[PDB]
Design a protein around this ligand. Structure first.
Ligand SMILES: NC(=O)c1ccc[n+]([C@@H]2O[C@H](COP(=O)([O-])OP(=O)(O)OC[C@H]3O[C@@H](n4cnc5c(N)ncnc54)[C@H](O)[C@@H]3O)[C@@H](O)[C@H]2O)c1
Ligand SMILES: NC(=O)c1ccc[n+]([C@@H]2O[C@H](COP(=O)([O-])OP(=O)(O)OC[C@H]3O[C@@H](n4cnc5c(N)ncnc54)[C@H](O)[C@@H]3O)[C@@H](O)[C@H]2O)c1
Ligand SMILES: NC(=O)c1ccc[n+]([C@@H]2O[C@H](COP(=O)([O-])OP(=O)(O)OC[C@H]3O[C@@H](n4cnc5c(N)ncnc54)[C@H](O)[C@@H]3O)[C@@H](O)[C@H]2O)c1
Ligand code: NA
Ligand code: NA
Lengths: 334, 334, 332, 333
């Protein structure tokens, strides 16, 4: 009995999740719901400006899409409760719309008949937050709604964990230079949420914006709670991002010690890089985070240290792969 | 007393229209209506990624914006009929939202109490269509709703006019390489109108798209009706465009004859250029169209001729300046 | 197995090594470039438009090891001194642009290479071949041929179909083209003197000349003198399309034209009906990809004007066409 | 009046001519670049990032006429061969980027120029000046000075305020910076061998080193050795910002920091409270523009980490600072 998945919101994250889940074993995507006709969804899945064509068969059947010979039901109801996840017997729902990133709203899928919900973004203090390779253990399968956190959280968390475990962290400020995203406008225009800076043209500007990945780091690594705060700078790349962390450490450290600590911590989720890469090189990586040893810097002024550690991540593909990893692990327990 | 104007849709065209109207004499903007809070509108009027900062004073008063010391009432009603144009005593309304681009929808402004309406886009066959400097004479002031046509039409019209008058046109195909616009998405995502190509990330792609500026050219130049059709290629420039016309002429022509005719036709609306300019040079021009003599090409094979003529235009500012010119001329007679 | 040497490890040369590694019966024995090997390895491994190389690439003393196989690296500016005979080289891809004529290219034959293919137009003494259009004109006796420009490989298959099926009186070509290295990053003086390539490539629509239309006679003789064209450079690092507005001898319908291109589809010439954009054409292996969605036939008083549009990745499509011509010329 | 020659009619050289025309008591007698006069005029008239030149520019035989005044044009790559002596040029603006040290700059003095100002860091033996911070150190006796890098002119006023009001223990600087000429249009070999500037400028976030922070000692001696930084080049043709995460000696609140920067405002150092973006800073005449919105103070256990951010137009902001240093240096010389 293979786990059944439905994807709510066939956006960048939802669509890439279908690509990765197809390769995954024990999981298949029974249905997708998005407020657009199925013809549009098929096109956007087949062709991709940043991630390349889907390496597989994609065809259109009436009210459905056939991916590699398997039909996937398509729905367009904006209200989650109305969706027939119960009639489909779906096990888990990927909440990728960005409008139901909270415990109560995610439960609407449970009312529709879905057993569990995983949110493709932060979901508040009431739901569990998981960065794979850091705190996947906390899941026991009993939770109805969990959150895979933000893309920046999946990039920062492994890097911050190593600094805390090996040297201890007093405090840190995080600056993430981030690719532009959907909430930004194509050209200067009114913004739905009221942000005067996302209202501005995404591809023309360095755009300051807030991010909570550092403050909310407490939900992933409790030992780091309250020690980090951060900001963001959105820049004209359609995908590909990096995370800088200026941190004060409890124990003194050398740039070689830090890089060696990260290399030991490398996993399927956390990569170690020594080449002189740039953002385009990170597009499509499956790591949730890619630590760049070249960017490590330790500065010592009068026996006082300030440390910069940097990790690349593809806000789209890196997060998606971490999302699928958390989805598989959550199925084993659930 | 001065002509009083209200702007519906404080978008790229609506906001630039406010800039040009301040400089214009005998015309002022009494109010703007947009489904945005005034705080956002003031900001987007003051700061511009492509057209530069507004050269003037702009401040926020309760439910209004004060531009150069003069109050402008701000409303946020999406339904045009509900706006109080009668109360404010508004001579003309600029329909710049892009959602009311036809005679019937535009009439909601007249119901609200506005005397006249000018549509910042094509409005079909039922309303008069005017490219200033080509057919403004057709207006007698009796019309309730008129259209300034598309930005592409204001570029194509003066160039095609010279060709028809001097050489005569059998037929022509138009290709306009056009800056990306709001109707395109920032990143691959479903599109509201269902266009699979405007759905694609605007800043990453050459995006073929339809344009009716060539077919509807009959409403501007009746002598050319049915003789032209064209398409568009949207490319990653935030503003600045050009229009090519490959045309068969009735009388034989040389490249020098064509350039001389266009220079003779030059006006405030139609410029003549001999420098080797590029798209960025056209940003902020006040001409509705700028003929590029350098790109003109006449090809003869066995006495059969094919002619290429090219003209630059800033889809935002060039169209906005033509829009104001038609707004004044229509206001003198209205 | 065909043994190939690449003179000039630029973007085309590097992508050619990627495509040749995938190809069976053909391998790259050596590359000669005056650039340091540490840099050449980096640009081979990492590509901003074409992505990471799907393979192993490491540097060993005086060579680079691609998928476990040594490839000799040389830095001699004089091709004749290179040991093409010792390595057993069959064909040379001349991608430097400095040996683009019969005599200079022959220096590779003196070095021991059997034949040479130039990745740019080659002059009045060498044959010009767009694979899938006129490879037949080769009789195997030639030492040096030219694969023409990337733009020629996009225009040629589409124009050949029009000439054979309907006949062409005349045509004008406009190619909306990705920006290229010769354009400056930011406004600055330009080496060749072009006031428009001097302008910042990623910020502008940049008119510029193209000779693909005039030279079409070398590929399709019956189209000689019937075509003229220009180019518009737009801010995409790769991916392009070619429009051709043409007057045809015989009347045609858009369905007739699209059906004809579909019949002409091959490994080199693709036929597309989806609503694609430039990013979708990046990395395609077709030399040209005809877009049926953009076809338009205009009739006004019995007089017709026809527009046909074909995509091509100026980098990869030309590279794959170059490899197709490279093997075919080695076999005859 | 003061006579100026521009060696290198690049982005900085051309913008310097625009600002120098507006300046009084200074005029540009000649420009030298390894380009034909036809090309130099075109690039002076038309600008993709800074807009068309608001003035008259025409071509005369071997010269360009800006606002009706002839400016002799030269194309000699060796400064020594240039005729600065015949032209009696008081100062030379070294904007090529190929003569950025005292020894190479002296070639202009051999050619007959009295003084040279380098539009970049010219080493730690030459006096280095950020206008509005340490212009006083110049007494006019120097033959070669440096106006420093664009990032230095952004960081210097902000760092000086922090040093005076709260004192600085140490700081790390990260500048998100517009791409520049030394980066390649498309992936290709790089002249200096930089594997990252070799990559296509408009497609990538490109880490790169910058010495603006370490050299801060030449501008603010009090800060010597306390700052180091790196840069991230991102795809904007112009417009930049500088972040500084710093440990302060005395505790501070974000409101205290913002108030201090506003008090320090001048023609060179601006204060901004709007939610601006990079395009908004294009064309500004400030050398640096402090963004109060971005200030942040992080206190964990009474241990403070402070972030201060300032925008700058790497082209125009530096050029206006360069002209300001040129005027002051011409009064003293
Ligand atoms: N892509 C990233 O950089 C990234 C990284 C991490 C997390 N996220 C999170 O992912 C979510 C959005 O992902 P994205 O940015 O790829 O999405 P997106 O911007 O492409 O749009 C989301 C999709 O959901 C659909 N949708 C909207 N409302 C809906 C509704 N009521 N019912 C059904 N479908 C609906 C939209 O049509 C669209 O197809 C957000 O929560 C965001 O924080 C995004
Ligand atoms: N931008 C150009 O190059 C250009 C050129 C010529 C014509 N136009 C025409 O101008 C119109 C809009 O142009 P744009 O691209 O600047 O628009 P835009 O993308 O800036 O947005 C239009 C504005 O209308 C507002 N709006 C939307 N629905 C509304 C409603 N119901 N009531 C009130 N306000 C509403 C939006 O909030 C926004 O401020 C379109 O019809 C377009 O065809 C644009
Ligand atoms: N561009 C910026 O944002 C910026 C900011 C601050 C400082 N600078 C400094 O200004 C200098 C140049 O910057 P840029 O980017 O404006 O330059 P640029 O890249 O536009 O070119 C400078 C000019 O110098 C010319 N040149 C080169 N070698 C020459 C020689 N031997 N003789 C004469 N002319 C020669 C070039 O042809 C070009 O016209 C560098 O020192 C740079 O660090 C630049
Ligand atoms: Na092989
Ligand atoms: Na002066």
């Amino acid at each position: 009995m293979s786990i059944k998945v439905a994807i709510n919101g066939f956006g960048r994250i939802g669509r890439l999740a279908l690509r990765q889940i197809e390769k995954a074993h024990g999981i298949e995507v029974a249905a997708v719901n998005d407020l657009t006709p199925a013809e549009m969804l098929l096109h956007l899945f087949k062709y991709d400006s940043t991630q390349g064509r889907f390496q597989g068969t994609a065809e259109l059947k009436d009210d459905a899409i056939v991916v590699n010979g398997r039909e996937i039901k398509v729905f367009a109801n904006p209200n989650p409760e109305e969706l027939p996840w119960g009639e489909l017997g779906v096990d888990v729902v990927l909440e990728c719309t960005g409008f139901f990133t909270n415990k109560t709203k995610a439960e609407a899928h449970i009312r529709a008949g879905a057993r569990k919900v995983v949110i493709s973004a932060p979901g508040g203090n009431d739901v569990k937050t998981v960065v794979y390779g850091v705190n996947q253990d906390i899941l026991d399968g009993s939770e109805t709604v969990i959150s895979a956190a933000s893309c920046t959280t999946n990039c920062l968390a492994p890097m911050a964990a190593v600094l805390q475990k090996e040297f201890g962290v007093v405090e840190g400020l995080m600056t993430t230079i981030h690719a532009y995203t959907g909430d930004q406008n194509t050209l200067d225009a009114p913004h739905r949420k009221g942000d005067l800076r996302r209202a501005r043209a995404a591809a023309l500007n360095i755009v300051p914006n807030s991010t909570g990945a550092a403050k909310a780091i407490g939900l992933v690594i409790p030992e780091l709670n309250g020690k980090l705060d951060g900001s963001a700078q959105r820049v004209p790349v359609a995908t590909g991002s990096l995370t800088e962390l200026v941190s004060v450490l409890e124990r003194p450290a050398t740039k070689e010690e830090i890089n060696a600590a990260m290399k030991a911590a490398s996993s399927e989720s956390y990569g170690y890089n020594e080449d002189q890469i740039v953002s385009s090189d990170v597009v499509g990586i499956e790591y949730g985070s890619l630590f760049d040893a070249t960017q490590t810097r330790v500065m010592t002024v009068g026996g006082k240290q300030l440390v910069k550690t940097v990790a690349w991540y593809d806000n789209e593909m890196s997060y998606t792969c971490q999302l699928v990893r958390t989805l598989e692990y959550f199925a084993g327990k659930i």
